[PDB]
Amino acid sequence: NLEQSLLVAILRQHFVAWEQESGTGASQAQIAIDDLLPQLQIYLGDPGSESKERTRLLTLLDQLKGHGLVTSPDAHERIVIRPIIAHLADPINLQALLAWLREQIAQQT
DNA sequence: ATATATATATATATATATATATATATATATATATATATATATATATATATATATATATAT
Secondary structure: OHHHHHHHHHHHHHHHHHHHHHOOOOOOOOEEHHHHHHHHHHHHOOOOOHHHHHHHHHHHHHHHHHHOOEOOOOOOOEEOEOHHHHHOOOHHHHHHHHHHHHHHHHHHO
8 A cells, every 4th residue: 555655665765775885785774763754754744643653653564564574663663674675576666656756745845 | 141169358246455433342440329237216015103083991
């Protein structure tokens, strides 16, 4: 669904950006939950409360863990991106949709 | 020119996944009400003594 696609695109670009610096296959840096909500806000707005957005992000991460793309949030609310994200079927789709929605919001604002 | 057997296109129906709302089961807390227990006071009945109304026995 749309939200899962956006989250996967964000995670994918984070992973590629990290690999650009530390090299291919470098141990992924732990990313906090607080860091992703501002970014999902860029494409989904504010659903009404922090208690709602954080819950949505957590359920999305748990859904993605089923496919193996991300680990479970650790005791301090940080996740790690799994290697399997690099081998998605068509990574070009993520870039296109993500940039398209970003351009949409930039045009409407 | 009609039947009779493939092939292709299209539509329908089903399965999977997720989001949202509702129902059910269970547990707990609360409030209310009922019933009971307790305490107190008063009423009734009986017993005993004295007072009022009436009559009889004993001693000389």
